[PDB]
């Protein structure tokens, strides 16, 4: 098949600046009939189908925006935003359509260059209610903060615990351009109560050391 | 006029077959080849086959196969994509569409296969505490522990949170899932609550944040 090469996954955009995504393919989509590339363009944003911008390689849609330019031949090609809007802020594949079966590509996302932000941290130990029912969940919030990556550690009085732990990241901030993100480690009410600190652990960029924050079973 | 209506999602049982209609309008299928298009969850697009009525023709991707039996009812301008003894896998949405490249994408209808029943979330407020002597910051929380299907709405105070807010995920915890919500608030004392919406077990809860 027509293997779609597309890198990287994601790539970091200032606003108003030119981007400039690319992608490569293994057999040409050349046709050498009408001469013209079979590759189209497309852009996905979360809960939307994709939206066809450049077909022919470089040949734009009905009510794409001229900052948007196809280009390419071959097997090498390029999508080219200048004047980055944060409308653009979306996934981008290239597909075929040249050949069977049709091939897309992974995708290349934009994220706007924010400043980094350091996460602030907070832990909440189990509600009242969290126990009757058996269980403990102690959630911790990382919430604004930049670049994307964190490492977040858990940990029952001092020591390690790397189970029972559900880590919802979130997407790029609209107004902020900025990441949250929400580590939970449930635990049973005895598993719970059999203990006493519990700490949140956040290693982020921001710092030059981790960033802590632990409760204690024991404290009002 | 060129329109793809779909369904928007189906919860079917595992090892079970779906049919997943796609009624098209402002053209006829019979005279083009309607597509279909599989998107797995925080993952890439990809193709099935597609139904080329008209010459009768109909090619899949070898990666479908049997699962997939793309047919199409001429007189009820619906395409169809049959799904054959389903797995997780399986779950992810399920594109119609005409991809010679033209745009037309329809709505796409999410299919989630789970042996789970629809059960009624679990609401649980993440008060904090902390009091310093005035000095401090705010920020509280919700959690929505299991529940099917998804999904379920959170707000705060009806609407007058928003900013601060946020609203991760509801990650999966075999068959049921949690979502946790946060907000800020700069320092007050009177009431803060969540509010918990659900549509399928018909369940509403607004938990007040008293705090601990």
């Known amino acids: 098949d027509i293997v779609m090469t597309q890198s990287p996954s994601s790539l970091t955009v200032t606003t108003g600046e030119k981007v400039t995504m690319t992608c490569k393919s293994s057999?040409?989509?050349?046709?050498?009939?009408?001469?013209?590339?079979?590759l189209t363009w497309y852009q996905q944003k979360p809960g939307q189908s994709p939206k066809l911008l450049i077909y022919?390689?470089?040949t734009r849609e009905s009510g794409v925006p001229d900052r948007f330019t196809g280009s390419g031949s071959g097997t090498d090609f390029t999508l080219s935003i200048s004047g980055v809007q944060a409308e653009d802020l979306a996934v981008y594949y290239c597909?075929?359509?040249?050949?069977?079966?049709?091939?897309f590509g992974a995708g290349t996302k934009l994220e706007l260059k924010r400043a980094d932000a350091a996460p602030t941290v907070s832990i909440f130990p189990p509600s009242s209610e969290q126990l009757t029912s058996g269980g403990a969940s102690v959630v911790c919030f990382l919430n604004n903060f930049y670049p994307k990556d964190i490492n977040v550690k858990w940990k029952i009085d001092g020591s390690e615990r790397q189970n029972g732990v559900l880590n919802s990241w979130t997407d790029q901030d609209s107004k902020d351009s900025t990441y949250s993100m929400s580590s939970t480690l449930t635990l049973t009410k005895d598993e719970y109560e059999r203990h006493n600190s519990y700490t949140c652990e956040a290693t982020h960029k921001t710092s030059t050391s981790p960033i802590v924050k632990s409760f204690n079973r024991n404290e009002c | 006029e060129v329109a793809l209506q779909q369904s928007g999602a189906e919860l079917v049982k595992p090892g079970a077959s779906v049919k997943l209609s796609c009624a098209a309008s402002?053209?006829?299928?019979?005279?083009?080849?309607m597509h279909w298009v599989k998107q797995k969850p925080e993952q890439g697009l990809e193709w099935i086959g597609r139904?080329?009525?008209?010459?009768?023709?109909?090619n899949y991707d070898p990666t479908f196969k049997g699962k997939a039996t793309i047919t199409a009812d001429d007189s009820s301008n619906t395409a169809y994509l049959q799904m054959s003894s389903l797995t997780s896998e399986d779950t992810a949405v399920y594109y119609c569409?005409?991809?010679?490249?033209?745009?037309?994408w329809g709505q796409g209808t999410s299919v989630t296969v789970s042996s789970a029943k629809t059960t009624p979330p679990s609401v649980y407020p993440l008060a904090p505490g902390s009091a310093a002597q005035t000095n401090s910051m705010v920020t509280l929380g919700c959690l929505v522990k299991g529940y099917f299907p998804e999904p379920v709405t959170v707000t705060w105070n009806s609407g007058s949170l928003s900013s601060g807010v946020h609203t991760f995920p509801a990650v999966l915890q075999s068959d049921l899932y949690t979502l946790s919500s946060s907000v800020s608030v700069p320092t007050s004392t009177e009431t803060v609550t969540c509010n918990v919406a659900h549509a399928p077990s018909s369940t509403k809860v607004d938990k007040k944040i008293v705090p601990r």
């Open positions: 597909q075929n359509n040249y050949n069977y079966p049709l091939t």
């Open positions: 022919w390689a470089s």
């Open positions: 569409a005409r991809v010679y490249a033209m745009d037309y």
């Open positions: 057999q040409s989509l050349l046709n050498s009939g009408a001469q013209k590339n079979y």
């Open positions: 402002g053209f006829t299928i019979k005279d083009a080849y």
């Open positions: 139904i080329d009525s008209g010459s009768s023709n109909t």
